Amino acid sequence: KLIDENGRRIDGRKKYELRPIKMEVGVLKNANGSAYIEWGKNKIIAAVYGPRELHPKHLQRPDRAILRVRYNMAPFSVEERKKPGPDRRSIEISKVIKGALEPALILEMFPRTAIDVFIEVLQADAGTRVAGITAASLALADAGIPMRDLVAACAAGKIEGEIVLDLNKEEDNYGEADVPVAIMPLKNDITLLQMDGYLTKDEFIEAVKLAIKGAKAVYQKQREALKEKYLKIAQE
């Protein structure tokens, strides 16, 4: 029943420590952009298409591109096999990911078009929606899409009384609150904010603040993964 062993966590982490995070851009031949993220035990691909032809004109918007996001978990990604197909959870995360990425995109630049983002969770462990939003910005940046900023994302929570950074499965399952946040760092604009659980106002707010610090950390890995991309075309 023990999540802080005095005052470290089950995996050895401190209250405000991140799980190891590795991200890579341009991992798929076919997508216009891609990123792969390993964030703790999470393994997620993001694919982007295009701006591409939207069908039909009914779905077409006259002055702008529409953003379509589909978040999905492979059946083998979870401890107990998931039948494939969206469920209510996935539908909701898709929506909120959409909402997290939209403000970052200059949609009026590709009118009558769709930009499709696919987030595939190959292994899940908590924080998939934030790891997904983090890799989905790199993938949009990978597809050469103009963006006001990257969208960086990270979750905080409350476990055994304490506000902590970046829950794993166990802490999320058994904790008291999970607060995912997504931001466009440069201007401190929160593009995702959810709270699941039970918090006082001052606990909610410390969590929002804590997750914003971890999102800013994740933001430096996004830039670094993008810097890595232009060190690879600078050959030669």
């Binding site: 909701e92 909120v96 403000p103 201007k187 604009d189 929160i190 904010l193 006082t200 106002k201 929002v208």
Partner: protein
């Protein structure tokens, strides 16, 4: 109607809204509980011209494997084609799903419906609560109207007394009713951010021009049991701080109306 962003935006700049509400005013609220007699519980809620009907239906069933300790609660939102031209025939779209999920969560996570007090026989026979949301007219702020109607309808609910007979092993459903173990009254308070101003309880017209929307669900003990920023746009930390604070205050004004409507119906 892109003419109308400009109008609404400029009115805001002058501190006004289209229907002369303050930034923190709700449109007139009508709560009425007990309206579907055949249901175990029900509530009709009007936020202005927004109208939503919730029904509570209960039966007895198996608990979930992992929680043999707990009764079952399940929330479904129907965005009926009659409510709006933007609503279509078919399975919930993501709007219906996200509203359902957020309203459930604020209730569940506050333990507003105490699922532990809904067991008949642990691991085998529990009460199963269906919260069935029927949106009748969409004129803005379904999130609040839905959460209001749902908690109002839980508090209205009278379910049959059930008895587990020990000599017989059987479960007797008595004619006598009792309330559900409703121990809190979470209420969603939703803001539209339009430009740099946040406005409570947006109408349809304000939702059509807002940048984004944030919902904070609070109970009477001063806790938060759900936050949901929805649609696009971005918020500033302090807009979030502001919304949390304002939500508790609007939630208490609304909780009070929820309570009157609940009592007016036991007369």
């Amino acid at each position: 109607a892109g003419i109308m962003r400009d109008h609404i935006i400029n009115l805001l700049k002058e501190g006004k809204r289209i229907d002369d509400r303050g930034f923190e005013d709700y449109r007139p609220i009508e709560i009425e509980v007990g309206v579907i007699e055949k249901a175990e519980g029900s509530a009709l809620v009007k936020l202005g011209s927004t109208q939503v009907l919730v029904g509570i239906k209960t039966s007895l069933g198996e608990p979930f494997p992992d929680t043999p300790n707990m009764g079952v609660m399940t929330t479904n939102v129907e965005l009926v084609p009659l409510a709006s031209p933007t609503f279509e025939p078919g399975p919930p779209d993501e709007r219906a799903i996200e509203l359902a999920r957020v309203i459930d969560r604020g209730i569940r996570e506050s333990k507003a419906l105490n699922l532990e007090k809904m067991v008949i026989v642990p691991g085998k026979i529990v009460r199963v609560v269906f919260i069935d949301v029927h949106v009748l007219d969409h004129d803005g702020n379904l999130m609040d109207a839905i959460g209001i109607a749902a908690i109002a309808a839980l508090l209205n609910a009278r379910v049959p007394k059930v008895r587990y007979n020990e000599e017989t092993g059987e479960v007797e459903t008595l004619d006598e009713t009792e309330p559900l173990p409703v121990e809190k009254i979470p209420v969603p308070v939703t803001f539209a951010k339009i430009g740099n101003i946040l406005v409570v309880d947006p109408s349809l017209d304000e939702e059509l021009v807002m940048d984004g929307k944030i919902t904070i669900t609070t109970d009477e003990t001063g806790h938060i049991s759900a936050v949901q920023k929805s649609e696009g746009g971005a918020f500033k930390l302090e807009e979030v701080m502001y919304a949390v604070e304002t939500a508790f205050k609007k939630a208490e004004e609304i909780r009070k109306l929820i309570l009157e409507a609940v009592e007016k119906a036991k007369q």
